[PDB]
């Protein structure tokens, strides 16, 4: 969540943009495919195993 | 891996992408690195691609 330069995109922003672009591409091309989004390093937890 | 197993359809491909900027997530703890390597090897054996 730190930006090296004032006029630059943080790593999180670039990751989110890439995920959204891939989602749109999948919707347009193959809508029957499966996608998921997970986060590691957060404070909260939500999973079957309760890690 | 648990998320992959939950799917009930037939999966031609299984892929994971890791968005990170920390080349040494586990440098203080060597055991954690060994566990991560073992888990990655198990995932590769199961047929899960890692990027």
């Amino acid at each position: 969540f730190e930006s090296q330069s004032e006029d630059e995109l943080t790593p999180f922003d670039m990751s989110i943009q890439c995920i959204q672009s891939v989602y749109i591409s999948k919707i347009i091309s193959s809508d029957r495919d499966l996608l998921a989004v997970v986060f590691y390093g957060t404070e909260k937890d939500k999973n079957s195993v309760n890690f | 891996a648990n998320l992959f197993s939950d799917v009930q359809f037939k999966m031609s491909h299984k892929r994971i992408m890791l968005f990170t900027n920390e080349d040494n997530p586990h440098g203080n703890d060597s055991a954690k690195a060994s566990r991560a390597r073992t888990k990655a090897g198990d995932l590769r054996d199961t047929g899960i691609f890692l990027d």
Binding site: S25, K26, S29, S30 | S12, H13, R15, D51
Partner: peptide
């Protein structure tokens, strides 16, 4: 394998359309 699409496996990454480019 080389030049493979990262969105749709099993298909080659189609290049962007360039239209007409005079020599």
């Amino acid at each position: 394998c080389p030049g493979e699409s990262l969105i749709n496996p099993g298909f080659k990454s189609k290049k962007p359309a360039g239209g007409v480019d005079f020599d």
